[PDB]
Amino acid sequence: TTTITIPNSYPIFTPNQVLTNKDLNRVVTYLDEQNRLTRVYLIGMGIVAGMEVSSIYQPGDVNIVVAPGCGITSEGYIISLAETKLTHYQSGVSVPSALFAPSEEQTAASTDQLVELFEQEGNNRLALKNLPDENAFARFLADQTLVVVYELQDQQRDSCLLDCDDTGKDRNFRLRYFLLPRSVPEKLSAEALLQQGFSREPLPQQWRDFSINDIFQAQSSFFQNFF
């Protein structure tokens, strides 16, 4: 859509005034956006401390481990992890595509079929310990990446439990782990996310024949050639 702009308008209060909900929403959005803009424009974006990924298959322990660290998303949200161990899985989960879109995009979108990983046992969550053998586990982890999603949910508060007064929503954040294929021609994959994210505005005419990972790798493979 567009890059986030600097908010220039925020209501001022006067005596003997009736107040509206938008009059408070406007100031809370203003302050939130200014803090986010500081973090994203004056420091930068991305993974700050390491989050190296490992996979363990022992006869008594089969899991995927992600090491502690912190990072900033492209929109000023701080993600902080510590020793995450994933042991159960659930395939065929329907996830909305608007989950990966910019917040300023207001369009609804269809759902895709991802695989989720969980740390705890659940109703429809198969454990990794029930895999047939090591080769099945190895075929499970082939040519795939992790992604950690920071989901926003607006939940309506209960109205009548003891007293029937009117109530309003709240905003909660959740962390989800999706195991994503590297390249699939018609399905969501890491390369498609990169294409949507970076190829937003036209590049110089000399770069026009490259994919985004290609345009990144051409710079690290510069010195093996051209010497």
Binding site: I43, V48, A49, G50, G69, C70, A82, S220, F223, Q224
Partner: protein, 227 residues
């Protein structure tokens, strides 16, 4: 010992603090000891004993690279201290070779890899800056790896500006005259500059061995000429 030093001079400046703890000094600051009356305040030291010194995340001052160099250096040391790192081959399977390199004053990472080491395991992990560029298969050394389009003797054909030391290997164990003659022919093939003499250990002189040392050739040349 050299490798040891290369490490300890680097790690001395590293400040990482990947995951802070807010409970360290939550609502106050400690200053140092109160000095003796009419003494000058300490103005050169960076870390007083009982002061609340500064600590940062590993982004600034270039630490995002040091955090890796130190690591890559420490690991290299562990490989140098292993059972099969001092690994010679039978002398009749090592033809002569001369390789240019940098002098003993240079950092260990910038020197040529000596040939008494186990090359197939240490040719990776010799120098970090070479590692980044993908040029670890071309560092000056005695061996070269298989399945790489490496011209056999590229060092001594292309311009020599940033080398000052000629490392000579392949001579130990042979006879005197053979080693001397092969060194002289290698001088002649590639146009290099140095002198060669041979000496004996002992206290008793032998027969005609003076015809080998780098004298009695201003005279032997004329005898050969008239002969």
């Amino acid at each position: 010992v050299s490798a040891f030093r290369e490490l300890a001079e680097s790690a001395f400046d590293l400040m990482d603090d990947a995951t802070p703890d807010t409970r360290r000094f939550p609502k106050f600051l400690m200053l140092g000891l109160v000095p003796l009356p009419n003494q000058k305040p300490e103005v050169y030291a960076l870390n007083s004993p009982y002061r609340s010194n500064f600590s940062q995340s590993p982004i600034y001052n270039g630490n995002q690279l040091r955090v890796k160099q130190v690591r890559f250096l420490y690991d290299r040391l562990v490989r140098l201290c292993a059972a099969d790192s001092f690994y010679l081959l039978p002398f009749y399977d090592t033809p002569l070779k001369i390789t240019p390199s940098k002098d003993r004053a240079a950092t260990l990472s910038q020197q040529a890899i000596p040939y008494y080491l186990n090359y197939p395991q240490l040719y990776q992990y010799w120098s970090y800056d070479t590692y980044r560029k993908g040029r670890s298969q071309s560092h000056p050394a005695y061996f070269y790896p298989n399945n790489a389009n490496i011209t056999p003797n590229s060092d001594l054909l292309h311009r020599l500006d940033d080398y000052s030391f000629y490392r000579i290997e392949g001579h130990i164990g042979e006879a005197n005259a053979t080693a001397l003659q092969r060194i002289l022919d290698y001088q002649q093939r590639y146009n290099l500059a140095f002198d060669v003499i041979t000496l004996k250990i002992g206290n008793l002189q032998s027969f005609q061995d003076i015809n080998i040392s780098g004298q009695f050739d201003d005279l032997n040349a004329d005898f050969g000429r008239i002969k």
